[PDB]
Amino acid sequence: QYSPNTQQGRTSIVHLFEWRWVDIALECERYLAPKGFGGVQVSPPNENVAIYNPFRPWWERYQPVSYKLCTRSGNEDEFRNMVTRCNNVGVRIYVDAVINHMCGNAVSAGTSSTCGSYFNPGSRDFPAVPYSGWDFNDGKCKTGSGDIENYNDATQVRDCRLTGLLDLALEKDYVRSKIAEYMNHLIDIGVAGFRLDASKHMWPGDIKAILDKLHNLNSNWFPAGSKPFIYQEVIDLGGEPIKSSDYFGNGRVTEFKYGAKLGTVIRKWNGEKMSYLKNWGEGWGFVPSDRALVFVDNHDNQRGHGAGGASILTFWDARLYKMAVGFMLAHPYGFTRVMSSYRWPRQFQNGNDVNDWVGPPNNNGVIKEVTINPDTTCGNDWVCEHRWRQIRNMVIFRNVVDGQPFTNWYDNGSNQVAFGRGNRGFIVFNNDDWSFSLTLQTGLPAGTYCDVISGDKINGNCTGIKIYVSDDGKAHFSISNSAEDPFIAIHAESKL
Ligand SMILES: *[C@@H]1O[C@H](CO)[C@@H](O)[C@H](O)[C@H]1NC(C)=O
Ligand SMILES: [Ca+2]
């Protein structure tokens, strides 16, 4: 459950947040496969509650009504079509599995679901699955309100409602089987793994019992004995009774300290500086690298809806964001996930975005298609960070330097650092308020290299900065603190 199951050479997955299945299928063929992306995190593919007040928010998808593959992203046929086409070009699909709960208890009964399924939160009836009052933790939760009230009590965190979401009794074999039935349907369709949403709110043992019921990956695309990739969403920062290490036996875990600390370092908050990143990784108290799923931001915290809070960097902070993503993709620690978002009208009031609920670009609730502009950027308000030259090229950089050791580190005791990956890559950063101009040892073979941040290597020449590495491996780098992108990266494949 620890291996991503990506094909040899591809080292990152991208979260195509709220994208339609048909757009993802196309993206796999026209961009993801050609550019070397390993896979895609898709939004929950199962039927959810259609919420109209506010108008179709992104979070309505974390509020399940049934396990029918029918949502605003498409129907079951379109979903299957997407998985098949993506797999055919070597790009894996990972499903966001919302299995800790069903919808909010206050939600009105009726057929206001993305597929018309009937449900009644009040009486605990979800006939489409089916689930009844016997399948929820109502009688088990001991809090006066029925919701989680204290996170210092590990029992309550697991058995009570996360902000009202009806909590499934995961210890019952019936419930475990209905969930496995759902997941095995997806595995047999061809998905390579799952993101287990809100794993902190589930007992490690209940998760294990469910995973024991899972099939091996589809033998038409994967080698026999392939187990699904499992990454657990567990927000573990400062001391809480629950630790992310309690979930290592089930698969990988999201390391939220990664994005939070990288954000404060790049923003230079609290007197932190890039020179401190010398021992980035486990040395900073993070989980072991082989159990970590890392990222700069995710769909929750990019809109202040989660762990990391104010320090989190997003596409809104373009310049610093690219630098953070650059550092992440170049550093050997963990398995990396790139974010791909959509724009929403941020409107801050007293320090809080009152429009953090806004769902994906749409026309009367119907999600808009991702349009590709002549310069490969996207239209219809999709940000497509994964298409930004700076990020796309660093995704490739990671593939090229895969397996190569962290070495040749340099720092000026402040905010301009550099390091290489074996003899396959080298990257330099200038985050100080003054220019950087120095000759550094790169460990790369002599030659002329194209800087992949400022440009590309297009048929025999570089469209941007060019770096010259001598016989002894040294090379001169000059980065003005005024540069559009204050960092340079070169690798074995950008060499002329
Ligand atoms: C690189 O570009 C120059 C013109 O700027 C041209 O003279 C040269 O032949 C090009 N090299 C290749 C390999 O295309
Ligand atoms: Ca629970």
Side-chain angles (χ1 to χ4, degrees), residues 2-496:
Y2 311 112
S3 302
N5 299 312
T6 54
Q7 77 185 181
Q8 303 300 180
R10 303 184 179 180
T11 59
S12 296
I13 63 179
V14 55
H15 180 24
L16 294 184
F17 185 47
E18 291 276 9
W19 280 44
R20 301 151 68 227
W21 306 149
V22 62
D23 285 313
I24 295 186
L26 287 170
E27 192 75 342
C28 278
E29 310 173 326
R30 78 190 169 207
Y31 195 85
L32 302 183
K35 269 53 191 175
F37 284 77
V40 180
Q41 264 217 182
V42 298
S43 292
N46 63 295
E47 171 174 41
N48 61 272
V49 181
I51 292 173
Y52 287 97
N53 172 46
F55 191 70
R56 315 310 298 285
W58 61 274
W59 45 257
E60 64 163 44
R61 299 189 76 162
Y62 288 87
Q63 199 137 179
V65 159
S66 78
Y67 296 127
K68 302 183 181 175
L69 280 37
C70 179
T71 65
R72 282 205 292 169
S73 280
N75 60 44
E76 187 182 6
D77 292 318
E78 304 176 301
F79 180 81
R80 267 203 281 264
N81 178 262
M82 165 194 77
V83 175
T84 295
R85 291 165 61 186
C86 287
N87 267 329
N88 284 345
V89 295
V91 180
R92 310 308 179 198
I93 293 296
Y94 302 94
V95 170
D96 194 334
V98 185
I99 60 171
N100 168 75
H101 53 268
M102 292 308 276
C103 67
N105 70 294
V107 175
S108 293
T111 58
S112 190
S113 43
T114 53
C115 216
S117 288
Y118 172 81
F119 63 110
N120 186 310
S123 60
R124 272 55 168 171
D125 285 272
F126 297 82
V129 176
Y131 285 139
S132 70
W134 304 109
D135 304 311
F136 295 91
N137 283 322
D138 295 307
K140 200 182 307 175
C141 173
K142 301 307 174 189
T143 65
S145 65
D147 294 350
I148 299 173
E149 284 168 31
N150 182 196
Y151 280 72
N152 278 160
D153 167 25
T155 298
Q156 153 179 180
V157 171
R158 272 57 174 275
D159 304 330
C160 298
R161 307 192 217 103
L162 172 58
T163 65
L165 273 359
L166 293 174
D167 211 57
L168 288 172
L170 301 183
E171 84 284 352
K172 288 187 57 179
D173 187 63
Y174 174 73
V175 176
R176 290 174 175 175
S177 295
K178 297 306 297 189
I179 289 175
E181 172 181 41
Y182 164 54
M183 296 177 83
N184 282 329
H185 175 55
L186 296 174
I187 289 179
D188 296 344
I189 281 178
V191 316
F194 305 88
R195 166 196 179 254
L196 301 186
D197 179 68
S199 292
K200 183 180 195 177
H201 302 285
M202 302 185 273
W203 292 97
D206 288 334
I207 294 177
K208 180 85 288 282
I210 294 178
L211 298 180
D212 285 336
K213 296 178 179 292
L214 269 34
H215 297 171
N216 282 153
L217 304 185
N218 198 104
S219 55
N220 286 294
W221 282 293
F222 308 81
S226 286
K227 286 194 174 302
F229 178 45
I230 299 292
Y231 51 112
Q232 257 141 175
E233 171 192 39
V234 179
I235 301 176
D236 173 22
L237 303 175
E240 256 181 301
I242 302 174
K243 301 297 180 183
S244 56
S245 64
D246 300 329
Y247 300 77
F248 288 172
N250 297 320
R252 297 208 185 217
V253 299
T254 51
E255 179 47 284
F256 280 85
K257 301 174 185 181
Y258 191 101
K261 290 314 301 177
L262 192 59
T264 74
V265 167
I266 274 62
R267 290 177 186 283
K268 291 178 276 185
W269 287 3
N270 291 37
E272 302 207 304
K273 53 194 66 174
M274 280 194 92
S275 62
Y276 294 158
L277 298 178
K278 189 179 301 71
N279 63 339
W280 182 244
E282 289 162 54
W284 277 55
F286 300 167
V287 300
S289 180
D290 60 349
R291 292 294 176 276
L293 184 291
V294 304
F295 48 98
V296 172
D297 64 319
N298 80 358
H299 65 292
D300 288 320
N301 66 23
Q302 77 168 181
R303 33 173 61 64
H305 265 293
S311 72
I312 299 299
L313 292 170
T314 66
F315 67 90
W316 294 112
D317 309 296
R319 191 157 178 279
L320 295 184
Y321 187 64
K322 289 181 289 180
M323 192 152 46
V325 170
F327 182 88
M328 174 181 80
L329 291 176
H331 196 286
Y333 180 94
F335 184 75
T336 54
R337 181 185 62 204
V338 168
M339 183 64 192
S340 193
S341 353
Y342 61 74
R343 306 169 193 293
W344 73 94
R346 281 204 306 187
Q347 191 169 180
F348 290 96
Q349 294 179 180
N350 295 325
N352 298 82
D353 175 9
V354 300
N355 288 324
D356 57 12
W357 57 267
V358 184
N362 71 92
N363 288 117
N364 291 42
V366 180
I367 297 181
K368 295 180 176 185
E369 45 282 296
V370 177
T371 52
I372 299 302
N373 295 315
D375 45 296
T376 74
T377 56
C378 299
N380 283 335
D381 289 313
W382 298 98
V383 184
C384 292
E385 297 94 302
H386 71 289
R387 276 166 172 278
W388 293 5
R389 177 187 70 252
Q390 358 261 181
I391 297 180
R392 171 247 295 154
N393 279 347
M394 282 309 287
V395 165
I396 298 169
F397 177 113
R398 200 176 179 73
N399 291 346
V400 172
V401 303
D402 188 45
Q404 223 72 181
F406 181 77
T407 185
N408 292 310
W409 166 276
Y410 164 81
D411 75 65
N412 68 334
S414 193
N415 302 98
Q416 57 204 181
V417 307
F419 66 83
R421 294 294 299 287
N423 69 335
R424 306 273 297 163
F426 198 75
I427 191 165
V428 186
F429 302 88
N430 173 20
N431 203 38
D432 272 314
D433 288 316
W434 60 88
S435 292
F436 174 75
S437 169
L438 188 70
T439 295
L440 279 44
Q441 161 66 182
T442 72
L444 291 177
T448 296
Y449 298 75
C450 294
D451 165 41
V452 301
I453 304 305
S454 64
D456 295 282
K457 176 215 275 193
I458 300 178
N459 56 210
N461 289 312
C462 307
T463 62
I465 295 176
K466 308 163 82 300
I467 304 295
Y468 306 100
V469 184
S470 66
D471 293 336
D472 49 36
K474 298 184 181 68
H476 187 79
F477 300 85
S478 187
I479 311 170
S480 160
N481 55 301
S482 298
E484 177 205 316
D485 295 302
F487 70 116
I488 297 174
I490 58 171
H491 57 75
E493 289 297 307
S494 74
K495 174 178 163 59
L496 290 185

